Amino acid sequence: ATVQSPDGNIKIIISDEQSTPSYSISFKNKTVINNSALGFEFKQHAPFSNSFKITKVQQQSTNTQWQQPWGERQTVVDQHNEVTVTFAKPQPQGGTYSVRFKAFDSGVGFRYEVPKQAGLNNIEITKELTEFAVNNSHTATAWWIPARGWNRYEYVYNTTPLNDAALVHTPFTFKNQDGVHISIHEAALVDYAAMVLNQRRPGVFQADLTPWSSGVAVKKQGAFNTPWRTIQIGEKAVDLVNSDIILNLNEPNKLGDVSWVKPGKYIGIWWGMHINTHTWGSGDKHGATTKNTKYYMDFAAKYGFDGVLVEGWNTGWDGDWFFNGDVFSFTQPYDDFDIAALTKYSKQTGVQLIGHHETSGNVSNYRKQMADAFALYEKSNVSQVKTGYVADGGNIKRIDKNGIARHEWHDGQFMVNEYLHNVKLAAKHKISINTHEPIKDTGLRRTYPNWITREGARGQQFNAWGTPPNPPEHISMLAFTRMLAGPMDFTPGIFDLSFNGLGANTNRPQTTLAKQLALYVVLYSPIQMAADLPKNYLAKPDAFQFIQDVPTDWQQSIALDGAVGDFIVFARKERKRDKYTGNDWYLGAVTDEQARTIEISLDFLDNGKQFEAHIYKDGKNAEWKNNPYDLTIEKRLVTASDKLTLKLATSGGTAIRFKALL
Ligand SMILES: [Ca+2]
Numbered sequence: 113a114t115v116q117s118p119d120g121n122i123k124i125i126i127s128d129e130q131s132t133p134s135y136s137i138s139f140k141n142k143t144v145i146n147n148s149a150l151g152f153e154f155k156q157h158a159p160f161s162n163s164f165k166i167t168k169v170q171q172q173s174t175n176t177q178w179q180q181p182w183g184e185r186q187t188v189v190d191q192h193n194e195v196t197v198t199f200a201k202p203q204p205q206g207g208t209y210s211v212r213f214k215a216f217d218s219g220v221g222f223r224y225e226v227p228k229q230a231g232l233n234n235i236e237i238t239k240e241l242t243e244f245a246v247n248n249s250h251t252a253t254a255w256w257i258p259a260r261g262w263n264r265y266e267y268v269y270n271t272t273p274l275n276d277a278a279l280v281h282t283p284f285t286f287k288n289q290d291g292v293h294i295s296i297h298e299a300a301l302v303d304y305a306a307m308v309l310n311q312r313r314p315g316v317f318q319a320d321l322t323p324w325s326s327g328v329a330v331k332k333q334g335a336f337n338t339p340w341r342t343i344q345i346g347e348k349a350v351d352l353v354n355s356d357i358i359l360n361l362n363e364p365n366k367l368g369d370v371s372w373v374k375p376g377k378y379i380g381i382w383w384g385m386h387i388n389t390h391t392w393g394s395g396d397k398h399g400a401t402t403k404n405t406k407y408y409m410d411f412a413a414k415y416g417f418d419g420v421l422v423e424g425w426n427t428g429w430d431g432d433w434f435f436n437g438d439v440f441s442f443t444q445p446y447d448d449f450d451i452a453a454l455t456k457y458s459k460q461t462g463v464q465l466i467g468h469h470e471t472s473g474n475v476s477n478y479r480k481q482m483a484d485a486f487a488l489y490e491k492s493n494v495s496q497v498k499t500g501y502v503a504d505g506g507n508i509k510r511i512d513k514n515g516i517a518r519h520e521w522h523d524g525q526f527m528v529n530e531y532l533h534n535v536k537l538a539a540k541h542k543i544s545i546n547t548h549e550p551i552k553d554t555g556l557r558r559t560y561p562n563w564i565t566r567e568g569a570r571g572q573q574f575n576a577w578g579t580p581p582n583p584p585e586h587i588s589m590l591a592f593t594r595m596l597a598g599p600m601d602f603t604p605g606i607f608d609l610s611f612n613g614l615g616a617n618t619n620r621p622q623t624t625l626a627k628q629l630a631l632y633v634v635l636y637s638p639i640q641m642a643a644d645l646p647k648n649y650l651a652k653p654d655a656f657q658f659i660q661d662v663p664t665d666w667q668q669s670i671a672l673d674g675a676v677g678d679f680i681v682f683a684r685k686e687r688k689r690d691k692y693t694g695n696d697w698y699l700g701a702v703t704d705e706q707a708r709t710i711e712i713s714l715d716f717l718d719n720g721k722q723f724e725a726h727i728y729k730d731g732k733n734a735e736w737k738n739n740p741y742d743l744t745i746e747k748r749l750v751t752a753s754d755k756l757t758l759k760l761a762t763s764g765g766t767a768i769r770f771k772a773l774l
């Protein structure tokens with residue numbers, strides 16, 4: 113059986129001639145994915161592996177579009193060809209299942225659909241046989257993070273030959289000798305175990321499902337589908353970025369009117385704890401006090417921020433909070449945090465409190481209190497909550513029905529279901545969720561639009577204490593790996609880079625000041641933190657104006673140019689909402705450790721309109737190690753027929769507001 117993208121460049125062949133059912137993929141008539149197996153092994157049920165033959169193929173197609181309530185673009189186009197291939201094996205130990213493939217111009221998605229059939233009752237998947245066999249893997253280059261490690265998704269990316277990527281998380285991005293870029297991921301991860309990729313024979317990446325502590329991967333009763341497995345394919349790195357395939361493979365919004373989900377910018381009592389000017393726990397340096405929170409709310413009201421995150425407000429942080437998962441209360445504030453007074457103050461100032469539920473990995477202690485915790489926040493005029501699951505890989509703690517503790521993975525079926533329960537319960541309270549230590553993004557924000565963002569990668573916090581901090585190349589890695597999954601709460605915008613001393617050997621963001629501004633356009637998130645202490649913004653009002661101006665919700669986004677681990681340039685048009693007219697464009701560009709010159713056409717600007725470009729760029733002598741603050745801000749009249757030369761310093765960047773003129 114064969115299905116092709118609408119433009120014909122991607123061709124999938126589904127076969128039953130190999131030991132199992134299999135598929136392969138060509139791009140512009142060159143094989144990029146060799147014969148790759150399909151099937152399942154179960155704990156007790158007979159396997160779905162060899163001796164299955166194709167009995168039926170059903171071809172359909174889609175050419176439609178839909179509108180996002182919020183996002184990186186307003187209108188999402190869905191154009192794909194689709195084939196459902198049915199396989200059957202005669203008795204004994206026979207069975208039937210189908211695989212549905214969707215072929216887009218930008219990539220492929222497929223999933224298994226296992227129907228009701230005799231003997232398929234309570235089953236436990238122990239292995240998914242799905243492969244991604246990369247052709248010519250010996251000359252391919254990959255940019256990847258290890259899976260099943262002690263620090264979850266929070267690793268810097270490795271640059272290696274593809275054959276050295278032994279066990280990796282997704283999105284898993286690489287390029288072949290021809291320059292074709294490919295990224296493997298999944299979409300709509302619901303009631304199933306996350307897929308890790310396990311390189312078997314050279315170039316053959318096998319699905320490796322993250323298991324329960326008992327050892328099985330996925331528990332199902334009867335008929336079941338898998339999540340989508342996705343293979344993005346493009347001739348250029350930015351062709352991976354500019355795809356909507358992940359959203360397009362998710363189910364439509366199930367929450368109805370979600371106008372109560374509000375993109376915007378926020379600040380927080382947060383960074384001070386990471387740089388040790390405050391503590392989460394009680395005492396003379398406690399960050400989460402009534403007085404401190406009102407001070408932040410006053411600043412947010414004056415400078416245009418919607419909310420103030422406050423961590424350390426609830427009892428349980430005293431001591432070493434990493435070990436306090438058993439004792440956190442999610443309803444009882446410390447005596448110096450007056451939540452009723454702050455609720456009144458939020459109504460006076462128009463600035464909301466952003467809630468915080470750190471579990472330190474004990475999800476049963478949280479689940480027990482969750483309904484009361486969200487009821488408190490709904491009563492307290494709280495619309496957004498940051499959650500946390502801080503524990504090493506494989507050390508989620510749950511208490512089972514017999515009162516016995518079990519350790520689980522953050523990305524097993526158990527936690528996949530635990531995260532979605534939290535999001536669905538929050539939605540009943542009109543609360544949106546920002547998940548730190550999350551399951552990776554698989555597009556579920558389409559279906560549940562209150563799941564607004566997540567961490568799930570190294571963000572700004574590692575630049576306070578990472579030892580080492582994130583390297584200069586980190587953003588240009590994230591843009592073509594982590595960010596292919598969806599929005600990230602990176603917490604950009606550190607203006608004081610000197611708190612541990614300058615140079616290349618201290619814990620600090622290893623960037624220039626202008627690169628910190630560029631992050632608001634390079635790294636998409638519907639909520640964007642201005643992460644620094646307020647006084648550090650007051651010290652640099654000219655640079656701070658860009659953060660005050662920049663929106664977080666876009667009617668269109670375009671990655672204009674870039675290369676994995678080297679640089680990225682984004683242009684985005686603001687969505688008409690709140691104070692934003694919908695007429696302004698914004699641009700952000702960042703580089704890695706190298707200074708880089710990038711020529712850009714401005715033909716993304718609307719035809720026939722004049723813009724005033726407000727350009728925030730690295731100064732003449734800027735250099736991230738010892739001269740990161742040199743900054744030039746200039747205004748230039750431009751139209752779509754103009755060009756721009758970006759001159760990025762070492763670990764530098766540029767941020768531009770294109771202000772439409774009336
Ligand atoms: Ca974290």
Ligand SMILES: [Cl-]
Nearest residue numbers: 264265549568
């Ligand atoms: Cl993580």
Ligand SMILES: [Cl-]
Nearest residue numbers: 582586587621
């Ligand atoms: Cl960084």
Ligand SMILES: [Mg+2]
Nearest residue numbers: 585677678704
């Ligand atoms: Mg590089």
